[PDB]
Design an enzyme around this catalytic site. Structure first.
Site, PDB file in Angstrom:
ATOM      1  N   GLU A  35      -4.047   0.239  10.641  1.00  0.00           N
ATOM      2  CA  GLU A  35      -2.909   0.533   9.795  1.00  0.00           C
ATOM      3  C   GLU A  35      -1.704   0.991  10.479  1.00  0.00           C
ATOM      4  O   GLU A  35      -0.562   0.562  10.331  1.00  0.00           O
ATOM      5  CB  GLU A  35      -3.198   1.138   8.435  1.00  0.00           C
ATOM      6  CG  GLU A  35      -3.987   0.442   7.798  1.00  0.00           C
ATOM      7  CD  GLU A  35      -3.558  -0.564   6.805  1.00  0.00           C
ATOM      8  OE1 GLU A  35      -2.332  -0.676   6.973  1.00  0.00           O
ATOM      9  OE2 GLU A  35      -4.336  -1.662   6.147  1.00  0.00           O
ATOM     10  N   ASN A  46       7.642  -4.556   3.074  1.00  0.00           N
ATOM     11  CA  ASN A  46       6.821  -5.864   2.576  1.00  0.00           C
ATOM     12  C   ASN A  46       7.699  -6.642   1.966  1.00  0.00           C
ATOM     13  O   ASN A  46       8.907  -6.453   1.503  1.00  0.00           O
ATOM     14  CB  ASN A  46       5.729  -5.251   1.461  1.00  0.00           C
ATOM     15  CG  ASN A  46       4.846  -4.554   2.086  1.00  0.00           C
ATOM     16  OD1 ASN A  46       4.558  -3.269   1.261  1.00  0.00           O
ATOM     17  ND2 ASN A  46       4.015  -4.876   3.145  1.00  0.00           N
ATOM     18  N   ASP A  48       7.766  -7.952  -0.935  1.00  0.00           N
ATOM     19  CA  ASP A  48       8.168  -7.854  -2.204  1.00  0.00           C
ATOM     20  C   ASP A  48       9.311  -6.714  -2.354  1.00  0.00           C
ATOM     21  O   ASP A  48       9.570  -6.188  -3.686  1.00  0.00           O
ATOM     22  CB  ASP A  48       7.047  -7.834  -3.083  1.00  0.00           C
ATOM     23  CG  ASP A  48       6.346  -6.456  -2.641  1.00  0.00           C
ATOM     24  OD1 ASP A  48       6.645  -5.579  -1.906  1.00  0.00           O
ATOM     25  OD2 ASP A  48       5.294  -5.877  -3.321  1.00  0.00           O
ATOM     26  N   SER A  50       8.535  -3.590  -1.504  1.00  0.00           N
ATOM     27  CA  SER A  50       7.959  -2.175  -1.461  1.00  0.00           C
ATOM     28  C   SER A  50       7.721  -1.951   0.141  1.00  0.00           C
ATOM     29  O   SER A  50       8.181  -2.741   0.944  1.00  0.00           O
ATOM     30  CB  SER A  50       6.724  -2.194  -2.118  1.00  0.00           C
ATOM     31  OG  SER A  50       5.623  -3.122  -1.261  1.00  0.00           O
ATOM     32  N   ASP A  52       5.334   0.403   2.843  1.00  0.00           N
ATOM     33  CA  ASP A  52       4.079   1.119   3.129  1.00  0.00           C
ATOM     34  C   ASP A  52       4.172   2.303   4.059  1.00  0.00           C
ATOM     35  O   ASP A  52       5.188   2.249   5.090  1.00  0.00           O
ATOM     36  CB  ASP A  52       2.921   0.162   3.881  1.00  0.00           C
ATOM     37  CG  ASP A  52       2.660  -0.866   3.373  1.00  0.00           C
ATOM     38  OD1 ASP A  52       2.669  -0.684   2.004  1.00  0.00           O
ATOM     39  OD2 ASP A  52       2.179  -1.878   3.754  1.00  0.00           O
ATOM     40  N   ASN A  59       1.458   2.118  -0.374  1.00  0.00           N
ATOM     41  CA  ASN A  59       2.404   1.294  -0.678  1.00  0.00           C
ATOM     42  C   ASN A  59       3.143   2.055  -1.789  1.00  0.00           C
ATOM     43  O   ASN A  59       2.648   2.370  -2.798  1.00  0.00           O
ATOM     44  CB  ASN A  59       1.860  -0.181  -1.187  1.00  0.00           C
ATOM     45  CG  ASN A  59       2.878  -0.910  -1.444  1.00  0.00           C
ATOM     46  OD1 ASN A  59       3.200  -1.467  -2.809  1.00  0.00           O
ATOM     47  ND2 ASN A  59       3.427  -1.829  -0.596  1.00  0.00           N
TER      48      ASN A  59
HETATM   49 NA    NA Z   1      10.562   0.197  -0.396  1.00  0.00          NA
END
Ligand code: NA
Ligand SMILES: [Cl-]
Ligand code: NA
Length: 129
Positions: A35, A46, A48, A50, A52, A59
């Site tokens: 990760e 990401n 969308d 968001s 991480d 997230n």
């Molecule tokens: Na964000």
């Protein structure tokens, strides 16, 4: 902070992740390697909108508040920046809530694709634990 493999294993064990919800320590070290490459400061955006955060790439749509993910839940009740600390406590405590939510470690895409079904004990071999 960039952890060594055994250093991170020892920290995760002290924080109660060994066999937490049945996942042996090697699973957690393997997930962290793929990760974040063991880097607590890792971030990734990401599609969308968001983001991480941290060694376990938690997230912002569900788990932490970064002030820029509209409609996001903050289920770990923490600012996402707290997940970037050299102290992994906040990441570990949030990860415990994630892994208890029903889908286990399948919540971590890299664990599913790169650790699940492999000899994860190799990630802690040689470590003084
Ligand atoms: Na964000
Ligand atoms: Cl993957
Ligand atoms: Na980063």
């Amino acid at each position: 902070k960039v952890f060594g493999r055994c250093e991170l294993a020892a920290a995760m064990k002290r924080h109660g992740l060994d066999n937490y919800r049945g996942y042996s320590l090697g699973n957690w070290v393997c997930a962290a390697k793929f990760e974040s490459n063991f880097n607590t400061q890792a971030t990734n955006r990401n599609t969308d909108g968001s983001t991480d955060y941290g060694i376990l790439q938690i997230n912002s749509r569900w788990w932490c508040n970064d002030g820029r993910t509209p409609g996001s839940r903050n289920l770990c009740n923490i600012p996402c920046s707290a997940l970037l600390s050299s102290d992994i406590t906040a990441s570990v405590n949030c990860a415990k809530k994630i892994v208890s939510d029903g889908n286990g470690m399948n919540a971590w895409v890299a664990w599913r694709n790169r650790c699940k079904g492999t000899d994860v004990q190799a990630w802690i071999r040689g470590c003084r634990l």
